[PDB]
Structure formats: C-alpha cells, structure tokens
Homo-oligomer: A and B are copies of this chain.
C-alpha cells in the first residue's frame, strides 16, 4: 500500500489583492509557515499564466525552483473555472461571464473556444512541471432539467451527454500525449454530479483512460449520498483528493434543495474540518487500503469560522489522519484439506 502525501492546501479560497495573498511567492511562504508541504494552484493569469508556461519549459522551471526554496511543491494545477466554460447552458451565460476575460464577455462561442485552449495548454504545462494529475470541472448543459418537472422530452439527456463527450474527447487526447490524468470534481451545477453521470460520461468518451475523478466527500454529504460506498465502487478511477467537511441537518422547513437560503441557514452547509459529519478516519482508511498515490489537499470553506483559523488547524488535522503503512507447500495444503 501507500502513505498518502500531505498536507497540502488549495489557494483559490485565499487569493486577494494585499499581502501575503497577492503573489504566488507570498502565498507559498504563507502556506509553508502554517505547516503545508504542497499547493494546488488555480490558473489565474495573475498567479499562473498557462500560455507562457505551455510555451517555455524554462518559465515552469523558474516557478518550481523558486517555490522549492521556501519548501513547497505544486501538487496539481486547477482549471475549475475554465472547465466550467467548456459547456454552459444559455440560462447561465451571463452569470459565468465574470469568470471569463473581459474581452470575451457577451461572446459565448469565443468564450468556449478560449476555455478549450486553456485546458489544452494546462496539459502541456503539467508535463513541464512533472505533474501527474489535473483538477477541473466538466460544465453543464442539462442542469436546469435535473428534476423531471416539466417532463423531459425523449433524447434530451442523451444529446447533452453526446455533446459533452464530443467536446471533451479532443481535450482528453491532449492529456494522453502528455501523460497526465484529468480529474473531474463531481459537483452540483455540473452534468457530472454523481457516480451514475460519470459512468454515463465515460461511455460517451469511449472509456477514455485519462477521464478520472477528484474525490470530495462534502458534495456527497450535501445531497444525502453515501460517500464511503463511492470509494468502494470507483477507487480505480480516483486520482485526487479534496479534504472538505460538511453537514446536513434536515428540519421541517427545508431539505436538500435549501429554499434559496444562504449558507448559514441551509440544512446542508460546509463546515471547517472536524465540525461536520464526514468520517475522515474511514475516508483515509479506504484511500490507504486501495493504494491511492496522491495528495490530501485541503479545500477550506465554512459558514461560521474565521478563515485564518481554518487554514491553521487544517495542517494538524490532515497530519493526524494520514496513516503510515507497514511459500506454498501444496503437499501440506493438500494434507490439511481432504485431498
């Protein structure tokens, strides 16, 4: 078996405009000062330009070396934002424009083609940095029709997954030639939001060997789904791990849908590590038992706790849950049995 690497931290929730949350160098020193050994880097042109990194290996060698001076390593790159723009339903076109470059706002086809190019540059930059996995979202074409009311016409869902496979298969081929695994995070508001849809997406891509899963148990808790049985079924396809807590406390007034309430008042909400319902002892045990060769990446989000306390407690929490791992005599065996 294998000892899970960590602790690491996802910087997306901590970027800002002042120090030390403004540059990658400063975020690396901040993370290393708290006890983390790795970082998951979002590909924002301010922090990490994918186009320069995909063009010159030298650009990547500078980033890698300068982070290693502080004691930090890049675990994976993140294209959650760009992956979302690969497939967008028109009802959400304007809500997502704030995630695209300003010059592309109001131009949906140009925004989609820019996102596909970003994903392909992410494969090449990952090879330069020596990374084995990459984190992303899948986008959503059919999410407005998640509940069968009004009744979904015949062929609607099948067309959505055929189109989704047609758009991601070229990108998946690019990750093959660079030897990088593509890990989708199953998340509400995506067509890939549970295990059934991931199996359906696989068949639409010809069972591509680079289509894998980023495991985050919090989203399964928020929809009352067994996150531990998920590991038992899909362990062969799990290549990345988000450590994130959540709780679901249904009342007589609201359930999973949430009633348009804010995060503080929803029955299902995210919590700081240790303050939710996730059995992280069981999660780390199963990942250790199924030979998971990856990083335990903290993705922090809480409805109550101050952000600087959550980032500090996460490092100790992860390090306490990581587990350090440790002839045939036919004739005799024949005698022991009836043979």
Contact = CB atoms under 8 A, between A and B. Distances in A.
A52 interface: no
Given A153-B333, A304-B288, A339 B163 contact: yes
22 contacts: A89-B337, A92-B150, A99-B150, A149-B187, A150-B189, A153-B332, A153-B336, A156-B337, A158-B328, A159-B328, A194-B255, A194-B259, A200-B260, A223-B256, A224-B224, A225-B250, A232-B251, A264-B289, A274-B281, A305-B323, A306-B326, A309-B324
Contacts of A306: 324-326
Contact of A1 (B143, B156, B196, B304): B304
B323 A304 contact: yes
B88 A160 contact: no
A87 interface: yes
A217 to B, nearest CB: 11
A90 to B, nearest CB: 4
A222 to B, nearest CB: 9
Nearest to A92: B150
Question: Which 6 A/B pairs are nearest by Cβ-Cβ distance?
Answer: A229-B252, A225-B255, A155-B328, A196-B259, A223-B255, A90-B338
A232 to B, nearest CB: 7
A151 B304 contact: no
Per DSSP, chain A at the interface is loop
A101 interface: no
B305 A324 contact: yes
B153 A257 contact: no
Nearest to A149: B189
Contacts of A225: 250-252, 254-256
Given A149-B188, A253-B194, A257-B223, A304 B333 contact: no
Given A194-B259, A197-B260, 13 more contacts: A92-B144, A94-B336, A141-B337, A141-B339, A143-B144, A147-B258, A149-B187, A153-B329, A159-B333, A196-B259, A224-B224, A233-B253, A305-B325
A204 B233 CA distance: 23
Nearest to A281: B275
A145 interface: yes
A1 B89 CA distance: 36
A103 interface: no
A307 B326 contact: yes
A263 interface: yes
A15 to B, nearest CB: 16
Interface string A312-339: 0000000000011111111011111111
A104 interface: no
Given A188-B149, A330-B159, A338 B254 contact: no
Given A289-B304, A338-B90, A144 B147 contact: no
User: Could you say which of A152, A160, A332, A333 has the most chain B C-beta atoms within 10 Å of its C-beta?
Assistant: A333
B146 A337 contact: no
A334 to B, nearest CB: 7
